[PDB]
């Protein structure tokens, strides 16, 4: 399969997901066409955070579908 | 970054598959060329009375193929391609002869200079370059570039004393340019979509453009305006052809219909008969005034010669309903599928057949015939796991694999298990093997198993973009060839062929608990049954104990690389006595 | 009353109490409860808050924090973060329901995208729902140009390359969004950390009113007026005292100014006076963070 990442700039990023693999693979690969530790990014589908430790079959995640790209700002 | 490839095809492939992109006429000597979405070239014989009309094709590109150009009088062939090259051939012989590698993305437009002998190409890396063709057939050669764009170019033409060269990108917005001088001229705007499609008069003072939006605009060279705007296509305009005297214009596009736009008074229309997938590159029969006949091309591999009679004396129903000539063409692969042990594909192509393919021998063992795609999936079901190791595209309308060097290594057999006749095989590293056979680097004082058959296309290709060499699997043990294959080839290809490197194995943690071992992945569960036998201790070991996964009883032969994917959702065991 | 180490819940309780219809929604759904047998802890501080303002006219926000693996010891968090579990565990509606809705309509909507390949002019479409709209600052100076950029024609090119299944080649595409349903409110999360990790010290323009007929998918005519924001006052993402203003919603004479809920200290400032704050004319500490945009 095919998704797509808006990334901070608002440009669209491109990834091939195989959607079997945890949220760890998907951040790396991330982390690979970005350079982002993948300790601070924080992905977004359908308004709810995408938890690690779990696949990608329990979002429905199918077809073409857009994962936005936040970090985290602490106070 | 090097990633090596190869096709399943058969020796002489002789219709169409995928469909035709362009198309160029010989009046001379009466042929045709397509050059199809199919990577091949194929020269067909436009004369009536050969029923068999077919001459030698051209196979050397990996790619579709975008737009064909006839120069020097027939003589030489100039072909474009997605794969970032730009070839010269020879269409007397039909073989390649050269080969122009600089450009950094797909190359779709291509123009001709009749009067003035040049060749100018675009592409999506938003550069155009001019070339001289008589330093072309005869050889690094010089680079002439004429660009000042801002986006990708997706037609291009030039007029016919090469003194005036227009371009069409998704700005909307055309721009002109001077050959002689490389200088900037016109900014030609007032479209509102992309422009696929750009004529010009013989002395340049006149283009023609047609839009996606579906209209065609007749613009002003000698005043920097449009002048006239027709609108008879609902959809938008993929073709477009004119008379000699720029007096009347044949357009089609994703509408389905094929009009004949007169352009002084632009209320006269007949209707040439409507094809039934999305005409694309319609070709004019240039013999005679009155054109006499006219070669549309589709989305599908038939190319038909519609004839025009009734034009001038018509006086909205279709004017044809059949076509006059046709070529037929085969069938292309739609989808694929990996059975569950990595060697056989399941592939659906249209019309509703089936084939049953192989992969390590690279050929078709069977056709399954008129079934129904997932009930023969589901019969076709093997209790087994095997990594994957490959990689299958389905563009081009055949089948490619690919083999990237993460996980080329990644899959281990047993002997019995490939078939043949305990050593433990690799099934990436044998095909390597195969493959680069005659290279005389490989030979010592696929290797002793199978041998893929000695036509085989290989390619070596860049992630995603230029291929940095095309080579037949037969011709290998040449001087040129050798030449380049001592370069082109990666390292991680080199130790594993050249020099015998055994590749890495794998290894997996499992937790024993009578309610840490490190084993290979492919350890059949008869040995974990043996080992605890063995161990406590106060044939015999098969019949006295038998292992639990998840409260099932384990089968002592499936492996334990299978356990962890099929039974199991570290890997955890329970043994009990009895 | 309020020690300065929950900053972030803080502000996002004071935001959310001037909502409209949350405070009555609650009460329902607290009540539903009441008789069957995060929610309780919700309806005890609304409780005491409510005290406090008879006499204008220690809360201690601990007990939500208790209740709510992230949330350990005194450390720094996000504002947007908390906002989402909070928004999250409020579930619960569902869950007690389904025996036999405060954020399916307060904050929720949908979305249409389209895809379209450029050689064969074919469209796609497909519906996410959106909670918020993350928009970028400032490209690689307006509200309507940044939303704009988060949702207009955008042409994916070069490596990004839309892989369409009708040619079964690596085309190319275009992108769109459109608005199908729009909640009650409508918040805006900036994007104000650049990856270059660092963070962009000019705001924007900020209006007070807003329309949403560009981008949507109906002819609507609905206005959106501001009614509170979320600020920052550092200077990297490490730290940083939140502050958080709302507009006085609906007492004699403070109608129409604007509040300032700054650390343990409440001061009433003035529309236009406030309006000239974040505005980039003066260079200012404060960057917002976030908008929320009550309908009418
Ligand atoms: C956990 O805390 C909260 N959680 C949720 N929500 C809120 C606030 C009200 C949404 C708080 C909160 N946070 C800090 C407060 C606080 N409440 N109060 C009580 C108060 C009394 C009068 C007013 C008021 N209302 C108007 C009106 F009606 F004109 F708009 C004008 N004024 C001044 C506002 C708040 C207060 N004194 N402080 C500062 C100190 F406790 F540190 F001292
Ligand atoms: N970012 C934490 C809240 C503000 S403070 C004063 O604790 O740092
Ligand atoms: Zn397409």
Same mark, same amino acid.
């Given at each position: 399969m095919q998704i797509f990442v808006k990334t901070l700039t608002g440009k669209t990023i491109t990834l091939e997901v195989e959607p079997s693999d945890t949220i760890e693979n998907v951040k790396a690969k991330i982390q690979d066409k970005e350079g982002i530790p993948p300790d601070q990014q924080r992905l977004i589908f359908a308004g709810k955070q995408l938890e690690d430790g779990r696949t990608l079959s329990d979002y429905n995640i199918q077809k073409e579908s857009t994962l936005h790209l936040v970090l985290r700002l602490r106070g | 970054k090097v990633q090596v490839s190869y096709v399943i095809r &058969?020796?002489?492939?002789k219709y169409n598959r995928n469909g035709v992109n362009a198309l160029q006429l010989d009046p001379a000597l009466n042929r045709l060329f397509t050059a199809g979405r199919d990577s091949i070239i194929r020269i067909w014989s436009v004369?009536?009375?050969?029923?068999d009309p077919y001459i030698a094709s051209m196979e050397h590109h990996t790619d579709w193929v975008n737009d064909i150009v006839l120069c020097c009088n027939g003589k030489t062939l100039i072909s474009a391609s997605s794969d970032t090259t730009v070839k010269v051939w020879n269409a007397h012989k039909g073989f390649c002869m050269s080969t122009l590698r600089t450009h950094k993305d797909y190359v779709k437009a291509l123009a001709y200079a009749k009067d003035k002998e040049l060749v100018a190409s675009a592409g999506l890396d938003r550069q155009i370059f001019l070339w001289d063709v008589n330093t072309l057939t005869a050889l690094t050669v010089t680079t002439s570039s004429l660009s000042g764009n801002k986006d990708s170019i997706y037609s291009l033409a030039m007029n016919q004393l090469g003194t005036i060269i227009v371009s069409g990108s998704t700005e909307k917005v055309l721009r002109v340019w001077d050959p002689r001088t490389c200088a900037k001229l016109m900014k030609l705007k007032g479209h509102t979509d992309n422009v696929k499609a750009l004529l010009l008069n013989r002395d340049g003072t006149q283009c023609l453009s047609g839009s996606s939006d579906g209209t065609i605009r007749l613009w002003s060279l000698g005043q920097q305006r449009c002048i006239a705007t027709y609108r008879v296509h609902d959809e938008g305009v993929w073709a477009l052809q004119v008379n000699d005297a720029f007096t009347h214009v044949y357009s089609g596009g994703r509408d389905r219909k094929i009009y004949c736009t007169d352009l002084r008074n632009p209320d006269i229309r007949v209707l040439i008969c409507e094809e039934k997938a999305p005409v694309l590159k319609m070709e004019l029969d240039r013999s005679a005034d009155p054109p006499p006949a006219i070669w549309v091309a589709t989305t599908k591999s038939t190319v038909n010669k519609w004839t025009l009679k009734g034009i001038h004396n018509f006086r909205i129903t279709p004017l044809c309903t059949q076509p006059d000539q046709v070529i037929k063409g085969g069938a292309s692969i739609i989808q694929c599928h990996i059975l569950n042990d990595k060697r056989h594909i399941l592939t659906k192509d249209t019309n509703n057949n089936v084939a049953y393919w192989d992969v390590l021998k690279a050929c078709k063992v069977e056709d399954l015939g008129k079934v129904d795609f997932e009930d023969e999936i589901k019969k076709r079901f093997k209790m087994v796991y095997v990594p994957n190791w490959f990689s299958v595209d389905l563009k081009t309308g055949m089948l490619t694999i690919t083999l990237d060097e993460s996980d080329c290594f990644a899959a281990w057999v047993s002997a019995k298990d490939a078939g043949f006749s305990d050593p433990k095989l690799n099934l990436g590293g044998l095909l390597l093997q195969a493959l680069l056979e005659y290279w005389p680097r490989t030979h010592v004082n696929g290797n002793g198993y199978f041998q893929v058959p000695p036509h085989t296309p290989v390619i070596f290709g860049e992630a995603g973009g230029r291929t940095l060499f095309r080579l037949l699997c037969? &011709?290998? =043990? =040449?001087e040129t060839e050798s030449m380049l294959l001592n370069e082109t080839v990666p390292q991680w290809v080199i130790d594993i062929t050249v020099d015998k490197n055994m590749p890495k194995f794998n290894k997996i943690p499992f937790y024993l608990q009578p309610h840490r071992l490190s084993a290979s992945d492919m350890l059949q569960v008869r040995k974990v049954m043996e080992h605890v036998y063995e161990k406590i201790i106060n044939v015999l070991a098969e019949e006295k104990i038998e292992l639990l996964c998840q409260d099932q009883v384990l089968d002592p032969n499936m492996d334990l690389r299978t356990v962890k994917h099929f039974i199991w959702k570290d890997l955890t065991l329970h043994y009990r006595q009895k | 009353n309020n020690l300065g180490n929950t900053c972030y819940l803080n502000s996002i309780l004071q935001v959310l109490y001037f909502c409209p219809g949350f405070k009555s929604g609650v009460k329902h759904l607290f009540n539903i409860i009441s008789r069957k047998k995060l929610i309780c802890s919700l309806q005890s501080l609304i409780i005491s808050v409510e005290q406090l303002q008879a006499s204008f006219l220690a809360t201690q926000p601990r007990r939500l924090l208790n209740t709510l693996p992230m949330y350990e010891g005194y450390l720094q968090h996000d504002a947007q973060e908390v906002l989402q579990c909070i928004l999250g565990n409020i579930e619960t509606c569902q869950l007690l329901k389904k025996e036999e809705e405060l954020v399916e309509k307060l904050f929720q909507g949908q979305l249409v995208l389209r895809t379209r390949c450029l050689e064969c002019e074919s469209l796609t479409e497909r519906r996410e729902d959106f909670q918020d709209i993350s928009v970028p600052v400032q490209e690689d100076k307006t509200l309507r140009w940044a939303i704009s950029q988060f949702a207009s024609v955008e042409r994916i090119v070069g490596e990004d390359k839309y892989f369409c299944e009708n040619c079964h080649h690596y085309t190319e595409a275009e992108r769109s969004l459109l608005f199908d349903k729009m909640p009650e409110v409508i918040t805006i999360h900036l994007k104000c950390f650049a990856a270059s990790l660092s963070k962009i010290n000019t705001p924007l323009l900020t209006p007070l009113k807003l329309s949403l007929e560009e981008w949507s998918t109906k002819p609507t005519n609905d206005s959106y007026g501001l009614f509170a924001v979320v600020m920052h006052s550092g200077i990297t993402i490490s730290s940083g005292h939140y502050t958080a203003s709302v507009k006085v919603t609906d007492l004699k004479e403070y109608e129409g100014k604007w509040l300032l809920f700054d650390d343990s200290e409440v001061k009433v400032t003035e529309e236009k006076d406030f309006l000239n704050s974040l505005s980039p004319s003066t260079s200012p500490t404060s960057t917002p963070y976030l908008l929320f945009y009550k309908k009418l």
């Open positions: - | &058969d020796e002489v492939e004369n009536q009375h050969k029923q037969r &011709d290998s =043990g =040449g | -």
